[PDB]
Amino acid sequence: PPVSELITKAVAASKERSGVSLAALKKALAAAGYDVEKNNSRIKLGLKSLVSKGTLVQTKGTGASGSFKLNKK
DNA sequence: TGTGTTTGGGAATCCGGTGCCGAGGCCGCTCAATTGGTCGTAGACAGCTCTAGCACCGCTTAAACGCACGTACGCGCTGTCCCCCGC
């Protein structure tokens, strides 16, 4: 399954008012058996694609270093 | 979500009493500083030599300088996780 679903599912499972950090996303995907080490660069890209698709709102920071929430709009 | 100000409250500080022991003074003594004198020599001074430090010049080339260009490291920001702190 593509990493955009795994990320969206992790952000939905950890839904809050702040927003899953990249470190929490790493932890959730690793707990989901996804190798976050080798494919970290893929994650940053896929995450960026999800922000560029507007599917994730950046709530703090800039780019992948930030916190993110599912764009309910 | 943020922050100027509030206010009871522990913690450091000030003040007065007090008492106690060491610092300051006094005395008797002694031994080390002082006086005077002799004598030896350490070094102050003159004087002489020669070396090695300074100033200069010219030439070559290697290093320093300025500049273009790119990337990688420093630094700021965010997050988390845990391990020292206060009690």
From Swiss-Prot:
Modification sites for N6-succinyllysine: 60
Modification N6-crotonyllysine occurs at: 27, 48, 53, 60
Domain H15: 1-72
Subcellular location: Nucleus; Chromosome
Modified residues (N6-(beta-hydroxybutyryl)lysine): 15, 27, 48, 53, 69
Residues the record lists as Phosphoserine modifications: 67
Record-listed N6-(2-hydroxyisobutyryl)lysine modification sites: 9, 15, 26-27, 38, 44, 48, 53, 60, 73
Description of post-translational modifications: H1 histones are progressively phosphorylated during the cell cycle, becoming maximally phosphorylated during late G2 phase and M phase, and being dephosphorylated sharply thereafter.
Positions where Citrulline occurs in the chain: 17
Description of how the protein assembles with itself and partners: Interacts with TSC22D1 isoforms 2 and 5.
Comment, domains: The C-terminal domain is required for high-affinity binding to chromatin.
Function (record text): Histone H1 protein binds to linker DNA between nucleosomes forming the macromolecular structure known as the chromatin fiber. Histones H1 are necessary for the condensation of nucleosome chains into higher-order structured fibers. Also acts as a regulator of individual gene transcription through chromatin remodeling, nucleosome spacing and DNA methylation.
Family label: Belongs to the histone H1/H5 family.
Name by which UniProt lists this protein: Histone H1.2
Gene (UniProt): H1-2
Shown part of the complete sequence: 38 to 110 of 213
